[PDB]
Amino acid sequence: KFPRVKNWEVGSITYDTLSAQAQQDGPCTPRRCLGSLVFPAPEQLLSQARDFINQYYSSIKRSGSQAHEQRLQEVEAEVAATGTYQLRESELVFGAKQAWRNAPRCVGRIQWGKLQVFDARDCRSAQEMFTYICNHIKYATNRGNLRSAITVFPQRCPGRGDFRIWNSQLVRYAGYRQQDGSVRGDPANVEITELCIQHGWTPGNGRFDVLPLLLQAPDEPPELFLLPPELVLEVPLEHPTLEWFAALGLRWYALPAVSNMLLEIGGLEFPAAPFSGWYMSTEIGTRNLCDPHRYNILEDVAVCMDLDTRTTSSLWKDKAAVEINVAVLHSYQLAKVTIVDHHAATASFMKHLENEQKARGGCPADWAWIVPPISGSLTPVFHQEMVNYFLSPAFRYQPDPW
Amino acid sequence: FPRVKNWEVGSITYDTLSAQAQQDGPCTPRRCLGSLVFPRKLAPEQLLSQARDFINQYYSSIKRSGSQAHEQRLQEVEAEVAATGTYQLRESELVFGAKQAWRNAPRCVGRIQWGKLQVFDARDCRSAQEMFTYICNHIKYATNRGNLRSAITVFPQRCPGRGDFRIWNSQLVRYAGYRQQDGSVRGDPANVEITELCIQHGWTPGNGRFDVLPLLLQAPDEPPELFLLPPELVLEVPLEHPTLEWFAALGLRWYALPAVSNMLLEIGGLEFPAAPFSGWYMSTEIGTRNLCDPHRYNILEDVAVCMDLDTRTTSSLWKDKAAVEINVAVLHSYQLAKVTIVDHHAATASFMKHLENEQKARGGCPADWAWIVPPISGSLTPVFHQEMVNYFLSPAFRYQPDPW
Ligand code: HEM
Ligand code: HEM
Ligand SMILES: Cc1cc(N)nc2cc(CNCCc3ccc(C#N)cc3)ccc12
Ligand SMILES: Cc1cc(N)nc2cc(CNCCc3ccc(C#N)cc3)ccc12
Ligand SMILES: C[C@H](O)[C@H](O)[C@H]1CNc2nc(N)[nH]c(=O)c2N1
Ligand SMILES: C[C@H](O)[C@H](O)[C@H]1CNc2nc(N)[nH]c(=O)c2N1
Ligand SMILES: [Cl-]
Ligand SMILES: [Cl-]
Ligand SMILES: [Gd]
Numbered sequence A: 001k002f003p004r005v006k007n008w009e010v011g012s013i014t015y016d017t018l019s020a021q022a023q024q025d026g027p028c029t030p031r032r033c034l035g036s037l038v039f040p041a042p043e044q045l046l047s048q049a050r051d052f053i054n055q056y057y058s059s060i061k062r063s064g065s066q067a068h069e070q071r072l073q074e075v076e077a078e079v080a081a082t083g084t085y086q087l088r089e090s091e092l093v094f095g096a097k098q099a100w101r102n103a104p105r106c107v108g109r110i111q112w113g114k115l116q117v118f119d120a121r122d123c124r125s126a127q128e129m130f131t132y133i134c135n136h137i138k139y140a141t142n143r144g145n146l147r148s149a150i151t152v153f154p155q156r157c158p159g160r161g162d163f164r165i166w167n168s169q170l171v172r173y174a175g176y177r178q179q180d181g182s183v184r185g186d187p188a189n190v191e192i193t194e195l196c197i198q199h200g201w202t203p204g205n206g207r208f209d210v211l212p213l214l215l216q217a218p219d220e221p222p223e224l225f226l227l228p229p230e231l232v233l234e235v236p237l238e239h240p241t242l243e244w245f246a247a248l249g250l251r252w253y254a255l256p257a258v259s260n261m262l263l264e265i266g267g268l269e270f271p272a273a274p275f276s277g278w279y280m281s282t283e284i285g286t287r288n289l290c291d292p293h294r295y296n297i298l299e300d301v302a303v304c305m306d307l308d309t310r311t312t313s314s315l316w317k318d319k320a321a322v323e324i325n326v327a328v329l330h331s332y333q334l335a336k337v338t339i340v341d342h343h344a345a346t347a348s349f350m351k352h353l354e355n356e357q358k359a360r361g362g363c364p365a366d367w368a369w370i371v372p373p374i375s376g377s378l379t380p381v382f383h384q385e386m387v388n389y390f391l392s393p394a395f396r397y398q399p400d401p402w
Numbered sequence B: 001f002p003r004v005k006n007w008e009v010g011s012i013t014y015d016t017l018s019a020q021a022q023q024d025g026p027c028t029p030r031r032c033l034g035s036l037v038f039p040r041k042l043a044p045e046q047l048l049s050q051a052r053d054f055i056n057q058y059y060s061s062i063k064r065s066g067s068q069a070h071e072q073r074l075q076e077v078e079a080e081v082a083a084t085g086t087y088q089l090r091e092s093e094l095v096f097g098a099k100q101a102w103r104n105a106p107r108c109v110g111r112i113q114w115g116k117l118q119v120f121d122a123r124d125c126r127s128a129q130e131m132f133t134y135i136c137n138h139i140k141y142a143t144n145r146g147n148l149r150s151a152i153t154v155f156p157q158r159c160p161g162r163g164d165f166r167i168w169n170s171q172l173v174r175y176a177g178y179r180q181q182d183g184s185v186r187g188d189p190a191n192v193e194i195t196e197l198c199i200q201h202g203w204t205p206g207n208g209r210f211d212v213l214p215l216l217l218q219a220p221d222e223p224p225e226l227f228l229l230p231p232e233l234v235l236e237v238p239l240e241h242p243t244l245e246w247f248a249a250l251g252l253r254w255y256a257l258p259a260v261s262n263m264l265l266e267i268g269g270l271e272f273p274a275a276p277f278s279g280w281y282m283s284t285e286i287g288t289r290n291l292c293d294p295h296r297y298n299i300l301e302d303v304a305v306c307m308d309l310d311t312r313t314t315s316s317l318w319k320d321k322a323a324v325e326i327n328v329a330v331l332h333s334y335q336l337a338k339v340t341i342v343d344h345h346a347a348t349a350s351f352m353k354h355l356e357n358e359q360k361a362r363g364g365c366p367a368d369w370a371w372i373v374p375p376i377s378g379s380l381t382p383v384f385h386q387e388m389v390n391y392f393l394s395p396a397f398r399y400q401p402d403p404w
C-alpha cells in the first residue's frame, strides 16, 4: 500500500508510510509524470488548523492533554468570531521549522531543527519592514559564521492587503539590458532591476551592483530601500592555483536569503516571511556562474585554461566547471564565510533520510532537485530512490505582486 | 495538455502525445515515484484491440490508413486470433514495431537514431544452438569491426501451451563477478548472481577482473545450455589516458557492444521475451557508472591517489577531478581504437533535436528526465533545463521477471 523505496548503492529498502498523509495534490497522474516541472472556507481553514494544532501538540508529547483540546475549541471559537485566528509564539516557531523540514527540494534539511525565528507579526510599515530585514541580515551573516534564520511578518488577513517583499532574494545583483539584447550583471534579475529604476532608483554600470529593496506595506505602493554597503558581506572569487582567475573580477555574496515565497501554517498564510541558510558551492559555481542564461563564464574560463573548446569530447566544459567550483569553495573558505560542498551536503542529507524514516516513517524529497547539478552519481543521493509529495506546513511559490 | 517549458531558452511546447498514453505508470496526485527504477508490478478480449490500433498506427505511418490496402490486414488479423488465439506479424510490421518501441523508450537518450535499426527475424528459431547462432551473427553485424550499428534480433513470440525463449544474461557481453573470502567481489559486482548461475551450469570460471561471461540460453520448456562466445567475437578496448601515462598500467578495459538481452518486446499485444538489441555506448555509462559507482568497479579513489590528489577532504573535489579524467580516458581510448562512442554533451544535444523533431511529428515525446540527464555535469548539458513528460506508449520495451 505504501511505496517501496530502495537505495541502489547499498541495497536497503524502506517503505514511505508518511506519504499517505500528504495533504495536497501534485502534478502527476497514473498516465503521465510531471516531476520535472519547476512550477507544478471556514470549514476548510478549520480542518487545516485542527491538523496543525494536532501536530504541534504531538511534538511536545502533549497529545490529548487539555492544553490540547482547550486550544482546539479556542481556535474554532476565534474563527467563528473573526474568520481567522492567531498563532501563539511557540506554535509559530514549530510551524516555521516544520515548513523547512517539509521542503522536498532542500538538501540542507539535516539542519531543520536549528532555525532562528524572528516574530515580526506586529510590523506596521515599510520603514519598520526594512528595519526587521536589516536586523535579519546582520544576525544570519554573523561576520561569516552563518546562521539559519526566518523573519515572519503579518499573516494575510481580510480587509487589509499583504506585506510583500518584491525582490526574489534579499541580496541580488542588478541586470542591465543592453540593446544588443545582451545583459550586464545577472540576467535573472532584469525584471526586478527595471522595476527598481521605475520606482526612482539610480542604477549603476557594474556586473555586481547590489539591488535595492522594494518593500510593500498593505494597500501602499512599494517603497525603495538601499541596503547599507557594510551589511552585505561579499566574497571576491579567486582560484587556489589559477592566478589569472582573480582577474575575472568575479564576486558572490555570502547570504542566500529567499524573500518571495509564501509560508503556510495551519491554514494561515504569510506572504512575507524571508528565510536564509548558507550556500552549497554548486549553486554559485555551476548554476549562478555557468548556466548559459545566467553569468555564463564557462567558455571564458576554459579558453583561459587553454582547453580545447572546439570539440565536446575533450570535456572542456566539465573541466572548467570543476575548477570554477574549486575556486568558489576556496574563495569562501579564505574569506571565512560558511559554505558546503555537494559531497558533504548530500552525505548529511543521507543521515537526514535515516533520521526522518525513524521519526515520521518517511521523508518527502524531489530527486531532481536533491541531486547536485554536477557529479550526481558520485553523490550517494543519486542511487537513492525518493517519494515526492506535499506536507503542511510548507513554503509555496506565489505570484509576483506586479 | 501539459505545458512544457525550456528554461535555457524560454520556449513552450504542449505534449498532445501524452493523451494517447494508455498504460498507467507509478505516480498519483498524492505522491511522485518517477525516481523508482522499477515501477514494478512486473484471452481474445483486447489482444484483438491491442492489435487493431497497432495495425492502424502502422497504416497511418505509411499514409495508407482508411484506404483500401488497410482493408484486409485489419479485415482479419482477427481470424488468425479467432482460429488459433494469436496472430503473426508480417515482416514489415515487425520492423515498424521494433523501431517504434525504441522511439517510445523514455529512458533512452540516443533516440535521434531510432529510424536506423537493423531487425533480424529469428522467429523461425527453435533450438538453443540455433539461438546461439542468431546471437553471434548479431554481435558480428552490430560490432562491425568497431563501426558499430544499431541492431535487434527478434526470437519467437510467447504463447500459452509452450515455454518462453529467454536469454539469461542481462547483456550479451558481461564481465564475471566472483564472490570472495572477504565477502567482497572480484570482477563486476553487478554480475555476481549470473556468474555462479553460469558456474555450475557447467562453466569453468576464470581468475580475472574482466572474464567475459558465457551465454546461458533457454529454448521453450527445456533447461538452459551454456555457450562460450568466441574471443574474436568480443571486441574490447584497453583503457589509456592521453597524458597520464600511468593510467594504462591500471589495466582497465571495457567491451564495445552494449547489448541488452533480458527485456520483453511488446508489439501489438504480442510479447517477445527474448529479443536482444544493441547500439553504442555513451562515454558516461563506462566512465562514470560502470567504473566509478561504489557498488560497481569502484575505482575512483585509486585514480585520485595516482593523480596525487588530496583524498582527506571532500572540498578538494578530488572525486570530481578523478571522474572527469576516467571519462577523458574512456573517450580517448575508444577513438584510438576506432570504436564508435559518443560523449554526453554530443548525445544530449542530439536528443534536444530529437525532441523538436518529435514535437512536429507526433506532438510530444515520452522522456524520463532522471535517466536522460547525464550522471556527471548534468546542468552543463541542454537536457537539464528542459521539462519533460514521462508516459508509456506502445509498442514498447518492458522489464520482466528473471526466468529462474
Ligand atoms: C543552511 C544551509 C542550507 C542549504 C545548504 C540549503 C540547500 C538548498 C539547495 C541547494 C536548494 C536547491 C535550490 C536550487 O538549487 O536552486 C534548496 C532548496 C530549498 N530550500 Fe534549502 N538550504 C539551506 C537552508 C534552508 C532554510 C533555512 C530553509 C527554510 C527556512 C530552506 C528551505 C528550502 C526551500 C523551501 C527550497 C525550495 C525552494 C524553491 O523550490 O524555490 N533551506 N536548499
Ligand atoms: C545507438 C545509440 C544509443 C545510445 C547512445 C543509447 C543510450 C542509452 C542510455 C545512456 C541509456 C541509459 C541506460 C543506463 O544508463 O542504464 C539507454 C537506455 C535504453 N535504451 Fe538507448 N542507446 C542507444 C541505442 C538504443 C537502441 C538500438 C535501442 C532499442 C533498439 C535503445 C533503447 C533503450 C531502452 C529500451 C533503454 C532503457 C534501459 C532500461 O530501462 O534499463 N537504445 N540508452
Ligand atoms: C535557503 C536556501 C539556501 C541555499 N543554499 N540555497 C537556496 C536556493 C534557493 C533557490 N530557490 C530558487 C529556485 C527557483 C526560483 C524561481 C524560479 C523561477 N522562475 C526558478 C527556480 C532557495 C533557498 C535556498
Ligand atoms: C541499448 C543501449 C544502448 C546504450 N548505449 N546503453 C544502454 C544501457 C542500458 C542499461 N540498461 C540496464 C540498466 C539497469 C539494468 C538493471 C537494473 C536492475 N536491477 C538497473 C538498471 C540498456 C540499453 C542500452
Ligand atoms: C527543468 C529542470 O528540471 C529545472 O531547471 C531544475 C532541475 N533541477 C534543479 N535542481 C536544483 N537543486 N535547482 C534547480 O534550479 C533545478 N532546476
Ligand atoms: C534512484 C534513481 O532514480 C536511480 O539511481 C537512477 C537515476 N537515473 C539513472 N539513469 C540511468 N540512465 N541509469 C541509472 O542507473 C540511473 N539510476
Ligand atoms: Cl542563489
Ligand atoms: Cl554496462
Ligand atoms: Gd599557477
Ligand SMILES: [Gd]
Pocket (backbone or CB within 6 Å): none
Ligand atoms: Gd576577456
Ligand SMILES: [Gd]
Pocket (backbone or CB within 6 Å): none
Ligand atoms: Gd608519483
Ligand SMILES: [Zn+2]
Pocket (backbone or CB within 6 Å): A028, A032, A033, A034, A035, B027, B031, B032, B033, B034
Ligand atoms: Zn511523477
